[PDB]
Amino acid sequence: QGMRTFRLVIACPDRVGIVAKVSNFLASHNGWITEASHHSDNLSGWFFMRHEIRADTLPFDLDGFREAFTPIAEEFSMDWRITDSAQKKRVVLMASRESHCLADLLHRWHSDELDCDIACVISNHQDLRSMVEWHDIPYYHVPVDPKDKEPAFAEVSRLVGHHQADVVVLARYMQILPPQLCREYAHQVINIHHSFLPSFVGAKPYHQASLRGVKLIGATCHYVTEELDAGPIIEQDVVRVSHRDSIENMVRFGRDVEKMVLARGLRAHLEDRVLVHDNKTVVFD
Amino acid sequence: KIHHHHHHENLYFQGMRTFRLVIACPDRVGIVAKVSNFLASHNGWITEASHHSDNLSGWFFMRHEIRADTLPFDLDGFREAFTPIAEEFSMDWRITDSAQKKRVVLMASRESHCLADLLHRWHSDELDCDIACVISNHQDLRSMVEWHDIPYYHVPVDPKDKEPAFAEVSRLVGHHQADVVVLARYMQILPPQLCREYAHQVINIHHSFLPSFVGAKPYHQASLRGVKLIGATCHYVTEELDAGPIIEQDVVRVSHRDSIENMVRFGRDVEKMVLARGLRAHLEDRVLVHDNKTVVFD
Numbered sequence: 001q002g003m004r005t006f007r008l009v010i011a012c013p014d015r016v017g018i019v020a021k022v023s024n025f026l027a028s029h030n031g032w033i034t035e036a037s038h039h040s041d042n043l044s045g046w047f048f049m050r051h052e053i054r055a056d057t058l059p060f061d062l063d064g065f066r067e068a069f070t071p072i073a074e075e076f077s078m079d080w081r082i083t084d085s086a087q088k089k090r091v092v093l094m095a096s097r098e099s100h101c102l103a104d105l106l107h108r109w110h111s112d113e114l115d116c117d118i119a120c121v122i123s124n125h126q127d128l129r130s131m132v133e134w135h136d137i138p139y140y141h142v143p144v145d146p147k148d149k150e151p152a153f154a155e156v157s158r159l160v161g162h163h164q165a166d167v168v169v170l171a172r173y174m175q176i177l178p179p180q181l182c183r184e185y186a187h188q189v190i191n192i193h194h195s196f197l198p199s200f201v202g203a204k205p206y207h208q209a210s211l212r213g214v215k216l217i218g219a220t221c222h223y224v225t226e227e228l229d230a231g232p233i234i235e236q237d238v239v240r241v242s243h244r245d246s247i248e249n250m251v252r253f254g255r256d257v258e259k260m261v262l263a264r265g266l267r268a269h270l271e272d273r274v275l276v277h278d279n280k281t282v283v284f285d
Numbered sequence: 286k287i288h289h290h291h292h293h294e295n296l297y298f299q300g301m302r303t304f305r306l307v308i309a310c311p312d313r314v315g316i317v318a319k320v321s322n323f324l325a326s327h328n329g330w331i332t333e334a335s336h337h338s339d340n341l342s343g344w345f346f347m348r349h350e351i352r353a354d355t356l357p358f359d360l361d362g363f364r365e366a367f368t369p370i371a372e373e374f375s376m377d378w379r380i381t382d383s384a385q386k387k388r389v390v391l392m393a394s395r396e397s398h399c400l401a402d403l404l405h406r407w408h409s410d411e412l413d414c415d416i417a418c419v420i421s422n423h424q425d426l427r428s429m430v431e432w433h434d435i436p437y438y439h440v441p442v443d444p445k446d447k448e449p450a451f452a453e454v455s456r457l458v459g460h461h462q463a464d465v466v467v468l469a470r471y472m473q474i475l476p477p478q479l480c481r482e483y484a485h486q487v488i489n490i491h492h493s494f495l496p497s498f499v500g501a502k503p504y505h506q507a508s509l510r511g512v513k514l515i516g517a518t519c520h521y522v523t524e525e526l527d528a529g530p531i532i533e534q535d536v537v538r539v540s541h542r543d544s545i546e547n548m549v550r551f552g553r554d555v556e557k558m559v560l561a562r563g564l565r566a567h568l569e570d571r572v573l574v575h576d577n578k579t580v581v582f583d
Contacts, residue, residue, distance in 0.1 A: 001546065099409055107401045113550065134432060207288045207295070244583060247295045252411060256558060285542060 004055040005034060005085040006065060007272045012078035014040055014047040021072055022049070029068075030057050037284035041277065048275050050284045055084070062087075083272050088117045089166040091266075092159075094173035095123050101171035101192055102128060104259040105266070106135055114263075116270055119163035122156060124175055144175050153178035160185075169266060170224070172258070182224045187232070187276050189224040190269060192262035194254055196220060196238055201229045206250045209241075216240050217250055219258040221265030223276065232276045234265040234283065302353040303332065303383045304363060305570040310376040312338050312345035319370055320347075327366070330355040335582035339575065346573050348582045353382065360385075381570050387464040388417045389564075390457070392471035395425050399469035399490055402557040403564070404433055412561075414568050417461035420454055422473050442473050451476035458483075467564060468522070470556070480522045485530070485574050487522040488567060490560035492552055494518060494536055499527045504548045507539070515539055515548055517556040519563030521574065530574045532563040532581065 012018070019038075026033065035052040060068055062084045073080050095102045102121070108114035120138040121128070132139040140159055144152040157178045160168060168181070170191040182189050195205035196218030202208075209217045218238035225231040237260060239253045268274050273284045310316065317336065324331060333350035358366060360382050371378050393400040400419070406412040418436040419426065430437040438457050442450040455476050458466060466479065468489040480487045493503035494516030500506075507515045516536035523529040535558060537551045566572050566581050573580045 001544070100405075103401075103405045107398070107405075111397055111401075113553075204288050204292055207291050211288060211291060242583075247291075248299065255411075256561075260554060260558075 003034075005052045006055050006058065006062065007083045007085065008049075008051045008053065008069070008080070009083075009272050009275065010047075010049045010073075010078050010080045011275050011277060012047055012076050012080070014042075014045050015076055018047060018049070018076055021076075022051075025069070025072060026051070026053065029059060032057050037273075039282050039284075044278060046277055048277070048282045048284075050273065050275075052085075055086075081272070088115065089270055090119045090164055091116045091167045091169060091270075092119050092163055092165040093121045093169050093171050094156075095121060095128055095171045096174045097125055097127050098172040098255075099128055099131065100255040101259055101262050103131060104263060105169070105171060106131070106137075108263060110135060114267065114270070116167075119165055120159065122159055122173075124152070124173075149176065157181055157184075167266070167269060169262075171262065177224065179226075182226060187223045190234070190262075190266055191222055191224050191231070192258050192265075193220045193222065193229060194258055196236060197222070197229060197233065206247055206254055210247050210250060213243075215242065217254060217257075219254065219261045221261045223281075225279075230279075232279050232281050234268060234274055234281050235261050237261050303350045304353050304356065304360065305381045305383065306347075306349045306351065306367075306378070307381070307570050307573065308345075308347045308371075308376050308378045309573055309575060310345055310374050310378075312343050313374060316345055316374055317347070319374070320349075323367065323370055324349070324351060327356050327358075335571075337580050337582070339580075342576055344575055346575070346580050346582075348570065348573075350383075353384075379570075386413060386415045387568055388462055389414045389465045389467055389568075390417050390461055390463040391419045391467050391469050392454075393419060393421050393426050393469045394472045395423055396470045396553075397426055397429065398553040399557045399560050400426060401429060402561060403467070403469060404429065404435075406561060408433060412565065412568070414465075417463060418457065420457055420471075422450075422471070447474065451478075455479060455482075465564070465567060467560070469560065475522065477524070480524060485521045488532065488560075488564060489520055489522050489529070490556050490563075491518045491520065491527065492556055494534060495520070495527060495531065504552055505545055508545050508548060511541075513539060515552060515555070517552065517559040519559045521579075523577075528577070530577050530579050532566065532572055532579050533559050535559050 032054040033051055034054060037050045039048040066082050093102060093105060105114065109118055118137050120140055121132045122140045122142055124142060124144045126141050129139045142152055142155045157180065168185055168189045172192060197220040200208040216238045218236055220233055221235045222233045223231045237257055239257050241250050268283050275282045329351045331349050331351050335348045337346045356363065360380060363380050391400060391403060407416055416435050418438060419430045420438045420440055422440060422442050424439050427437050440450055440453045455478060466483055466487045470490060495518040498506040514536045516534055518531055519533045521530045535555055537555050539548050571582045
């Protein structure tokens with residue numbers, strides 16, 4: 001149950017023989033499949049698949065499996081990858097002043113639940129340094145001059161680059177990202193937004209929810225794209241509120257939802273379970 | 286622009302000191318007339334009022350939050366001035382001061398998820414209380430507790446002779462003058478005197494949706510039964526095992542896709558959410574116990 005696996009993730013145009021062709025390849029090579037997920041989107045004519053395969057009994061290393069599988073990938077014009085479960089992804093966390101999401105992720109990492117390397121935390125304030133330095137994770141204070149954002153932008157993108165980041169996570173980071181960053185890290189920048197999108201975009205979404213008098217509020221984990229708050233949704237959830245709940249109390253319930261939803265989305269990402277197509281996700285749980 | 290003005294207005298009135306009057310008594314026609322008249326006569330402005338009748342036992346429950354500074358006396362004077370009404374109506378009652386922090390003793394064994402959640406809420410000023418200390422049967426959680434400058438007492442349990450451990454937990458809880466003892470996944474037997482001395486002041490988080498799956502390894506039990514939801518139960522500890530008054534419960538969906546280790550992991554999130562919610566209700570004097578059940582005024 002604590003065994004090394006390779007994960008094969010595929011999105012491609014639907015073809016009749018893909019399951020046959022991939023299963024023949026895997027079975028003939030003693031691919032012990034521990035997990036297999038499938039989805040067809042008949043309206044766009046696309047197919048999606050994910051396999052977890054025992055590494056030790058497959059007669060390939062990671063590079064050799066990639067090479068051996070390339071002829072099938074090319075035959076079916078696949079968007080694909082193979083990863084090694086024992087190869088930790090490098091995560092960069094970004095945070096401003098709110099600590100709830102950051103502390104949650106750091107606890108999960110510290111307790112060996114969240115399987116990854118936290119490369120560093122970047123922040124526009126000094127507030128969260130102490131909690132981050134307790135974990136012996138580098139903490140970087142990159143303050144943002146609102147009159148001149150280019151130096152802040154450059155230093156963020158340099159630090160991300162230096163740490164060879166595989167994922168950038170905005171744990172309630174409230175400033176504008178360097179515009180190039182989501183272009184270079186396409187579907188690798190994960191945000192937690194504090195409303196149940198597409199409702200209540202913009203500033204103070206709990207205030208907006210209170211004024212509209214909704215009976216449930218929520219949070220949305222999504223990939224960041226060039227268009228504000230419009231990126232592919234990875235996970236959402238909600239919590240019930242009533243007339244009895246002041247804004248302060250809604251914000252407080254919201255923190256718990258934000259924490260949970262970000263954690264679920266990041267882990268799905270880390271485990272190579274999330275695929276993006278037509279600005280939407282398939283999430284193989 | 287209307288959503289920012291609402292941001293200022295909401296901050297403007299926040300954090301004003303209240304007294305909390307909490308009553309349970311035999312239900313009678315004139316209880317509310319008499320209490321509200323008493324408050325009105327002393328110019329007390331009630332900013333929250335929650336009433337409940339239990340028609341099967343014929344009991345009445347109420348909680349009023351009153352602006353402390355609209356009244357002409359301190360907490361002691363309120364108690365003395367209110368005693369005649371309490372006696373007339375045979376009330377089980379109390380008055381607390383929102384500015385007086387309750388002293389919480391936390392207990393933990395090896396699992397850190399509930400304890401870290403509560404410590405974080407405390408440190409970020411969300412959880413209004415003083416954490417007097419953490420008592421633990423192991424040394425594992427020392428480092429995280431001591432970072433917060435909270436005392437940590439390692440009281441190892443000798444499973445052959447449990448009395449030296451029991452005596453020390455009781456001494457420590459007494460020395461810190463605890464108002465609440467919270468078992469943040471503490472897995473050892475409590476001193477039997479503790480839940481009698483601290484009646485309805487010892488709060489536990491149990492890792493099953495009670496009354497299902499009592500005993501050892503509740504997640505393993507759920508997996509074998511093949512249920513499609515699992516949960517956690519926050520409850521007061523009483524002399525009878527697992528049977529105490531339930532404060533809060535919640536659940537998370539599971540399916541055939543989920544291994545026991547996945548279910549245990551989902552469990553940790555339900556446990557910590559449910560414990561936090563239950564502790565907060567208690568700290569705010571929103572929980573009244575009657576007939577082994579709770580009224581929770583939200």
